[PDB]
Amino acid sequence: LEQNQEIDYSNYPEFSWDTMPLYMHVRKNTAYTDEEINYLASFPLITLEKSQAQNTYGSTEEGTLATASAIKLKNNKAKVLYYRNVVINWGNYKNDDEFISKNPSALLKNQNNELVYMPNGSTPFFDITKSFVQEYWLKSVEDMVATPNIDGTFIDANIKVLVPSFFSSKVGVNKQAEIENSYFSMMSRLKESLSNNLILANIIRVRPEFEENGLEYLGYFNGSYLEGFDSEAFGMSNAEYLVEGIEATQKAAQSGKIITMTLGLGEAIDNNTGIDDQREDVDLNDEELNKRVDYLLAIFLICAEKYSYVYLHDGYLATNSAVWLHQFDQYKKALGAPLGKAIKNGYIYTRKFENLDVWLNLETQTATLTWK
Amino acid sequence: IDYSNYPEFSWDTMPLYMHVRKNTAYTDEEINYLASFPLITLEKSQAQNTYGSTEEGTLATASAIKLKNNKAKVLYYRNVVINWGNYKNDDEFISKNPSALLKNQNNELVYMPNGSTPFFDITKSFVQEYWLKSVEDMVATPNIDGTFIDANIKVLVPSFFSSKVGVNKQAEIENSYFSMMSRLKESLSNNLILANIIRVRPEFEENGLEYLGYFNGSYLEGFDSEAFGMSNAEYLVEGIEATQKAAQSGKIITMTLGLGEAIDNNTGIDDQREDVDLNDEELNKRVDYLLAIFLICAEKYSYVYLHDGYLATNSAVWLHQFDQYKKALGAPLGKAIKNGYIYTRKFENLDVWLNLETQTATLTWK
């Protein structure tokens, strides 16, 4: 497996321990307002998702360029990443639509010559085993990253390539191995061509198939995004699953890799409204909600090192998120640099920072943040 | 009550409903499966990637179903306010008439939670006429027996639109909706109109019965999904009471209940989706429970669907028949009896015992 490169922080985002280090990961179907641009520009690291303002700019490619230009004019130090899925042919990319229309052989088929799909039955996959698909995809990423207001790329669906059953159950064992081989070739190409830029990947993940829960695959990347971090599977308890995720994240962060930890608040915010009635306004000062914020931040702080950033989210679509444009009080309070590593005692973790003491219990799913 | 356009019904075995879409044409086996149900709703996005549009995919599917079983009743889905994709005729109409879409007081489009799907402004006469004709034209085709009208409750719960377009516009949407439903009641009097209307709601003192006079029956969803601070059991008690009254009055009931949560196995996102054992003891207990809720309510022309979503290619129960669907049921020998949260009912070949509090039921088949 690809080894990690020697650490060079030249192109890394800004980072401070003074207050919570925050990540943003976002789309909107139309252009951001000026106020929204100012909000985005306040984050040190921003990923622009697929379906980026396409109903204003006609395409994600153009909506990305316009959004990134506006962010950079407000804060030229904000780092902006372009999302790219390595295998799923999601909609709203004008260049992808043209490429697939002109070249139907670019899509992935099973051994019976049938197109295979995501669970919606309509979104297909790129057959990255084909040279011309690899070249198209790599060029699309390199061309976008080369533009002035884009600093790097967020690579998605690595785990769909690397967990053998995902594609072997669709296209067979040999084709899965071929997809994997081509994936490694493509990531090696980006590691070299984007060496003066940033590459983040959705890669660290508790998986029975991954002996090191994704750390073994970080060699191509400046860091990992984390999702599914508190969503247990494989018969593991919630606490057991988080213990493994925390260990992997601590190791990656201590190695100097960027970490962008996403944790959902959707379940703590939902109040059984919004489907056939107005969605009830969320009291973002609610005491129980803030206990959940404390808990999720405590998980993050037990792991964090320099270049670790957190996003407690209500989905990535700005217009459907109750936390969009908002900042919890925990994000404004003095944090300060760690005074050492977390201490683990069973499912209880503690950590001291210059202005904060953290206590976390994974079994009870509770935490305390004692600000100084 | 005029039953002349109603579907077939038998108590001999479980009366079943089907509610379905697929992005491409059904296979022959799938058409035979559809044709075996007495009442089928064809959803939006109906084979549009084979036939080019939902309109033509609906026509093709319905023709094939009726060739296999001409007695099957087939309904065309139509949303009264949401402009969902894949209707070629809607795309043409909206492109030509952007003013057909609902805007707020700043003249901005308003959307569903996805931020992209807009709404028909049904306060405008030309929109009303386009919509009504689209329904009437499709129901007049030979292989379609009626329509399934969706999103009634989004019109009738004031906060849904008032929070988007203002209180005056919501009242006007509601007024126009009633005019449109009165028109359809008359034009489709030789056909079937099923609506997504019975629903426990604080705004509806009769939980949707007060609107049922426009329609030949109701589809039910959200039926076991409590809200408003209500307990699950008391929320179901209210839905059961509404459904019993409707069914006993001769209205069609199509009760949908999700098995998604009892089938979900924490796989299929980044790995292969593991088989759910459809013969499992635990899944069969859940089927028994959900069928018991249905049977406590059912009358002639009540039908049930225990589902894993409406997209055929993503459903673990597509093409499947639970054993509970094959056993002799027989006619009810009395209405359900309610003793607290425990209901019982006797049929010729089955005794039902249902406890809403524990979410368990016992089906004693003879």
How do the domains of chain B map onto residue ranges?
17-84+122-331
Query: B21 to chain A: nearest residue by CA?
Result: A121
Query: A205 to chain B: nearest residue by CA?
Result: B270
Query: Chain B partners of A205 at a C-beta cutoff of 8 Å?
Result: 270
Alpha helices in chain B (DSSP H): 28-35, 48-51, 54-68, 88-96, 125-140, 152-156, 158-165, 167-187, 232-248, 260-263, 281-297
Query: Chain B partners of A232 at a C-beta cutoff of 8 Å?
Result: 266
Report which of B284, B157, B271, B293 is spatially closest to residue B220, judged by C-alpha positions.
Answer: B293
Closest partner CB to B270 (pick from A163, A276, A277): A163
Closest partner CB to A166 (pick from B228, B270, B311): B270
Query: B113 to chain A: nearest residue by CA?
Result: A320
B259: closest CA of chain A, how far (Å): 17
Query: Chain B partners of A319 at a C-beta cutoff of 8 Å?
Result: 111, 115
Q: How many residue pairs bridge chain A and chain B with CB atoms within 8 Å of each other?
A: 63
**CA distances in angstroms from A259 to A20, A43, A246, A303, A339, listed in the order given:** 14, 14, 12, 9, 20
Find tokens 């043409």 and name the residue: B92
- SS3 of B338, please? strand
Tokens of A233: 């599977």
Tell me the technique behind this structure.
Answer: X-ray
Tell if the CB–CB gap between B272 and A232 is shorter than 8 Å: no
- SS3 of B63, please? helix
Alpha helices in B226-320 (DSSP H): 232-248, 260-263, 281-297
Q: Which CATH number fits domain B17-84+122-331: 3.30.9.10, 3.20.20.70, 2.60.40.1250, 3.40.228.10?
A: 3.20.20.70
Tell if the CB–CB gap between B311 and A234 is shorter than 8 Å: no
B85: closest CA of chain A, how far (Å): 13
Query: B200 to chain A: nearest residue by CA?
Result: A276
Give the DSSP per-residue string, A154-222: EEE-HHHHHSHHHHHHHH-HHHHHHHHHHHHHHHHHHHHHTTTSEEEEE-----TT-TTTTGGGGGG-S
Does the domain spanning A23-337 belong to CATH 3.20.20.70? Answer: yes
Q: Which chain B residues have any C-beta within 8 angstroms of a chain A C-beta?
A: 22-23, 49, 111, 113-116, 153-154, 157, 159-160, 162-163, 199, 222, 226-228, 266-268, 270-273, 311, 313-314
Report which of B276, B280, B279 is spatially closest to residue B263, judged by C-alpha positions.
Answer: B276
Pairing type for strands B350-355 and B360-365 reads antiparallel
Instruction: List strands edge to edge, sheet with B337-339.
Output: B337-339, B342-347, B350-355, B360-365
Query: B110 to chain A: nearest residue by CA?
Result: A319
Residues B202, B204, B208, B211: what is their CA dihedral angle, to the nearest 10 degrees?
A: -160
Tokens of A273: 């409204």
Find tokens 């992209």 and name the residue: B116
Per-residue H/E/C for A243-271: HHHHHHHHHHHHCCCEEEEEEECHHHHCC
Query: B152 to chain A: nearest residue by CA?
Result: A276
Find tokens 């057909």 and name the residue: B100
How many other C-beta atoms lie within 10 A of the C-beta of residue B46?
A: 28
Per-residue H/E/C for A286-314: CHHHHHHHHHHHHHHHHHCCCCEEEEEEC
Residue B280, C-beta contacts closer than 8 angstroms, at least 6 positions apart: none
Closest partner CB to A165 (pick from B111, B159, B272): B272
B153: closest CA of chain A, how far (Å): 6
For B335, phi and psi rounded to 5 degrees? -65, 160
